[PDB]
Amino acid sequence: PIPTRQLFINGDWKAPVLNKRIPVINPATQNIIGDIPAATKEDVDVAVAAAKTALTRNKGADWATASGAVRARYLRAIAAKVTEKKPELAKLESIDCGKPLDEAAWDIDDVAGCFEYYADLAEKLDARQKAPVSLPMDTFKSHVLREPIGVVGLITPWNYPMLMATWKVAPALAAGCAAILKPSELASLTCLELGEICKEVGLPPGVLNILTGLGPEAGAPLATHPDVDKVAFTGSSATGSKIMTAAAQLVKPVSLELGGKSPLVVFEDVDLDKAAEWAIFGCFWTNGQICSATSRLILHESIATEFLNRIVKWIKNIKISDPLEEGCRLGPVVSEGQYEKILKFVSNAKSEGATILTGGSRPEHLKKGFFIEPTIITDVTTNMQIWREEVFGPVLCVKTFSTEEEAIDLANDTVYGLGAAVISNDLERCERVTKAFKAGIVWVNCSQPCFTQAPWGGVKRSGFGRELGEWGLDNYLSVKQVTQYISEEPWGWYQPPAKL
Amino acid sequence: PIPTRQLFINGDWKAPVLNKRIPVINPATQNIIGDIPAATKEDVDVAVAAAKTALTRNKGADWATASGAVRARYLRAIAAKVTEKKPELAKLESIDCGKPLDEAAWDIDDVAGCFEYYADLAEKLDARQKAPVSLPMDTFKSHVLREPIGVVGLITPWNYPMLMATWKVAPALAAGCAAILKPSELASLTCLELGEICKEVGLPPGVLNILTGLGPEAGAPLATHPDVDKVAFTGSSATGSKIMTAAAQLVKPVSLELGGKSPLVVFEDVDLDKAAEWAIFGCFWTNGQICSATSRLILHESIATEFLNRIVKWIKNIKISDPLEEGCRLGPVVSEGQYEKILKFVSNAKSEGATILTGGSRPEHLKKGFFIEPTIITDVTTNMQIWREEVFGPVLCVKTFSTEEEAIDLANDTVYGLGAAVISNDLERCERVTKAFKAGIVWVNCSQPCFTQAPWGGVKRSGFGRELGEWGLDNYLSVKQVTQYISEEPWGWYQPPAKL
Numbered sequence A, B: 001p002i003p004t005r006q007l008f009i010n011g012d013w014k015a016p017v018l019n020k021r022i023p024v025i026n027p028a029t030q031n032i033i034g035d036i037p038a039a040t041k042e043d044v045d046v047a048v049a050a051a052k053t054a055l056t057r058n059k060g061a062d063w064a065t066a067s068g069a070v071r072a073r074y075l076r077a078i079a080a081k082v083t084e085k086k087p088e089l090a091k092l093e094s095i096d097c098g099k100p101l102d103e104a105a106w107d108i109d110d111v112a113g114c115f116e117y118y119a120d121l122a123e124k125l126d127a128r129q130k131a132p133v134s135l136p137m138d139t140f141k142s143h144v145l146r147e148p149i150g151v152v153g154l155i156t157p158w159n160y161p162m163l164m165a166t167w168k169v170a171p172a173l174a175a176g177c178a179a180i181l182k183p184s185e186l187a188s189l190t191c192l193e194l195g196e197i198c199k200e201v202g203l204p205p206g207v208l209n210i211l212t213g214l215g216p217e218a219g220a221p222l223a224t225h226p227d228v229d230k231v232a233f234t235g236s237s238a239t240g241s242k243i244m245t246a247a248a249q250l251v252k253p254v255s256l257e258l259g260g261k262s263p264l265v266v267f268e269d270v271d272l273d274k275a276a277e278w279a280i281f282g283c284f285w286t287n288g289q290i291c292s293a294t295s296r297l298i299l300h301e302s303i304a305t306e307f308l309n310r311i312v313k314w315i316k317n318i319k320i321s322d323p324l325e326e327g328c329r330l331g332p333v334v335s336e337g338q339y340e341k342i343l344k345f346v347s348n349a350k351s352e353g354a355t356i357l358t359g360g361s362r363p364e365h366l367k368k369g370f371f372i373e374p375t376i377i378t379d380v381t382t383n384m385q386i387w388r389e390e391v392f393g394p395v396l397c398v399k400t401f402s403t404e405e406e407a408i409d410l411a412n413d414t415v416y417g418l419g420a421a422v423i424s425n426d427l428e429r430c431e432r433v434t435k436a437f438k439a440g441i442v443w444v445n446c447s448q449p450c451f452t453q454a455p456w457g458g459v460k461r462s463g464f465g466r467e468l469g470e471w472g473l474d475n476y477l478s479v480k481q482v483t484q485y486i487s488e489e490p491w492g493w494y495q496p497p498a499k500l
């Protein structure tokens, strides 16, 4: 059932030069279920060269210098193909990364949705070219051209395998770039299947190249390659640093989407079951593996007790099972390494004097797989590890407040600044807290809903630059100023040689 | 004559903590003519804290959360002061960095012009807040807020002391940020005078801090400070690499405007005198110390002999003297170190078999000061140092071509990609060569003219990001997405606890 593939390079399948391969593990069962190719520098070198050629081939006429509407057709066709293979792609996603099937299906709709969104942006791009710049002199004219930034390396995480890749691939292709996508080794199946869809769409060879493998072996050489114009990255802050470090040696532009410790602030004037559902979605959905997870509950003390009672009840209704099982609302975490790391976060918080209100370990009824109960940790102190560090599992901590000012202070109490959410019936209070949040994304009376139309990214230690929306496309376009002297007069700055 | 000043921190003059100072040298005379304060980490610490406080003070009401029209008035008032003090400021610039007085007067006009431009942009910004994002669902509403990015470190070079400072300071202040400016230790006089102008205008304390000193002592701590939100930099690629390297540790956003080896392509179908003047302006103007200098001449063989003859005639008419002298069209280079570096490029070019068509050493009639004659180097081969490395002095090297395609390949034969220029009466040929240039900035039928209204920055090894125009303002604004659930229906993703 699980496909066996090569690297996708220059329009076709291709064995890694050193022919190495790595396991595919199903997090729900812990069994090895196949393998994926493991790329090295010599594969990067081939892929990058293929990308270069794809940009220059035929004067760039098939891709780079073609009109946006031409690229748009390719992106619409990729979108229709994804929609066609939805049932299979969603199942491979759930198998590969462990998210509930109903989540994977949502992801696959949004992959198609993203390609279509950027296809429409590609059609609008042609009219955006040669944008006049108004000048305070009639002796010059100036305009702007928007050109493909060039060869791009795209390095993505496993929590939303196909979708994270798409967020980068769609605008990059829409802008006329040629991409090397390096998906997470923990979940590469659906990205490899993106290769097949490229073949079936007839996407020009070298325009998209997919290289699976270990981060240091296959990701790292993208950031140190003379012919890579930009690296776009989503994942850990630590890996971000390393990639940014390496790129510096060649002053290569890098964009970083990183993790966070996002706050959800819940005021007293709310429907408790609505606010309880959003809090669970904010921390436990995607099996807690959300970069922008509201993993810190900032809860008005007047309702603390009854909110926590309600939220625990909701947790008890969450069906935790194999992701493919009907009605699944929580799957296993992606891997053994993470499973053990998450539980260590829970025990450390126990060792520091915090209370496990609910959850804390694997569920009793599941013997195999990396399953963890939705955990709520209470009696939490500002200096505890649980409060400051990203857990990336179904683990929420709770602190209480009374004043709006104290809630904001607790909210902004972190080195990160990706997401933030406020829930209150008082809308002027929502706006006030919105403005006070030091985050790139703020949700009002919800937590987590993510639209392709709107800009996505962090402040402080959560990285920089925005993806999605028009920002997403602009990340892959280089701006060229064209300024023209239209006066027939000599510049007249230097003294001319006398005539005779 | 030459003012004596302290650091400018938190609205007032303040001695370095370790009270060190460093000399000011007149490049024209080589005399020590005064001194400037030399900041260290502990001064950066004080300046950074001062910037922080400045953003939060009175709930940001004076500056950060104030309307754009309020910051505009401060910017217009700075612009008026610069204009008022033009004669003294221009003279200070010339004495400090060595550029002809007529050039410094032009810089000071544009300093004022830049503040005025960004004042207009600060006003327009109020109307750009809360821009709605159009959603494919009636159950959510979304918009964007544009907030100050926060505490910015601004690190600038000596070739346009006040103007380069302004390119960063004006948009940063227009965006409601608070800035720490670290000017070049080779030319800090006019930037310190910006300090006095801030006092006189009543700019809120901490909004602009001016820290003079050594690169590693005063600039470097900006890139490693947890409270610095962004570093904006213009200077050498090597220093750029270092700043980007340090900033990566805290995953801090950095923008780099670096040097290049920019080409000028001159086709046979042109007025030789006009083309000659522009080639001189492109390489020898500002004493050849232009990041975007067209330091490689790509000249059509059919006109090569007679073009080179004309350009030599024009060069002989360039008056080279003390920058304050009436009619000066070439001053000394900024420093001894630069002086010696440039002469080494000329002799290394001779050591490799290239010809020195004109210039090559100091002028005979000037016994003191770091003067170098405008230099044309011919018989150049692509592997020569002179062809590939940035000289940053009045040194032009020449190569010949016959076909448009050969000229483009020569033009793009470089790791850099800041600027580029085409001169031809055939405007359709200009457009073709424009599109083909791998550069951020292209000049048609001229070389070098620079407008505040138009985006400025490089591709490849010349850095990333764009300054000036609306791009300049956006560099200092963080994007905040605000997405609000407006449905009264429950999210309905999770199974609710049974009603009893």
Ligand code: NA
Pocket (backbone or CB within 6 Å): A024, A025, A026, A027, A095, A096, A097, A186, A187
């Ligand atoms: Na897997």
Ligand code: NA
Pocket (backbone or CB within 6 Å): B024, B025, B026, B027, B095, B096, B097, B186, B187, B188
């Ligand atoms: Na000086």
